Amino acid sequence: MTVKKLYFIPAGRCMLDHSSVNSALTPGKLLNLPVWCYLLETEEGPILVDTGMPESAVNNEGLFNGTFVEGQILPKMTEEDRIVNILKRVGYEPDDLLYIISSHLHFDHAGGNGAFTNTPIIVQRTEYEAALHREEYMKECILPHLNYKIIEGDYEVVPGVQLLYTPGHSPGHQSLFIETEQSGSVLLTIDASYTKENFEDEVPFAGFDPELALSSIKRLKEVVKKEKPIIFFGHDIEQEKSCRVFPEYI
Numbered sequence: 001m002t003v004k005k006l007y008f009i010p011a012g013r014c015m016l017d018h019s020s021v022n023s024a025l026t027p028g029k030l031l032n033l034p035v036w037c038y039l040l041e042t043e044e045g046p047i048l049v050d051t052g053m054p055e056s057a058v059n060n061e062g063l064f065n066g067t068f069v070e071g072q073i074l075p076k077m078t079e080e081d082r083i084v085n086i087l088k089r090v091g092y093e094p095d096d097l098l099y100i101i102s103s104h105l106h107f108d109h110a111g112g113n114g115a116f117t118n119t120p121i122i123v124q125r126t127e128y129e130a131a132l133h134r135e136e137y138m139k140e141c142i143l144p145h146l147n148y149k150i151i152e153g154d155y156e157v158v159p160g161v162q163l164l165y166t167p168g169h170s171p172g173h174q175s176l177f178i179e180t181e182q183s184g185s186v187l188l189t190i191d192a193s194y195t196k197e198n199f200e201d202e203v204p205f206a207g208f209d210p211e212l213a214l215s216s217i218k219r220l221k222e223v224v225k226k227e228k229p230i231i232f233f234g235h236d237i238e239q240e241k242s243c244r245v246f247p248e249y250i
């Protein structure tokens, strides 16, 4: 086996229109949503899940001016939220990590990937291929010479750390099913559901293929029925109220 510690580590924030968390809502109210990374302390070494936002977002809420998402996505990132600075404060440098796991290559999950030039970065083949051409991918999230460990489908990273292929929000989105010493089974949906209501109630939210995202939610509900994990959503302002966060762990 089990992971020794699972840390939730705030990595900045992002404003998103509320129509991105519930596709039925009337656009025009932004929500200041959390961006997370996760650090797993395992017998084999530390594994980082996602890497925050790119340096171009630092003190630059207008990063997406002049793009298809102008006014709809505004990163809220300071110098402290750079993943190398986060990791140094927690006690690590990039080359200390055993693996990086990219849930997907959207900007607030892979914007720090370039900091890791030796650590294998585990990413789904269908996400890597999408990032090579789809417009919602920033160049910082698909740098060409990193040590990618491309995978296809479900995958065991080390004992206690399983990747569940959950496409739809993005073409190769993957969620995590972790077994921890303190808590037992934990499901990190990541962006397979931004919020509890996207998951439980199947409220539609932003995604590349909403129908496929719904089938991935149904698949995760089969896993939930079998494993009864505690479940954490990708950008849920209500749940963030009660999350244990670094230096606490689960």
Ligand SMILES: CCCCCC(=O)N[C@@H](CCS)C(=O)O
Pocket: 014, 015, 016, 033, 106, 107, 108, 109, 136, 169, 170, 191, 206, 207, 208, 235
């Ligand atoms: C196609 C679905 C969305 C692409 C735009 C995008 O990168 N949105 C963010 C939301 C940050 S609060 C994400 O998915 O993590």
Ligand SMILES: [Zn+2]
Pocket: 104, 106, 169, 170, 191
């Ligand atoms: Zn995403």
Ligand SMILES: [Zn+2]
Pocket: 106, 108, 109, 191, 234, 235
């Ligand atoms: Zn996200």
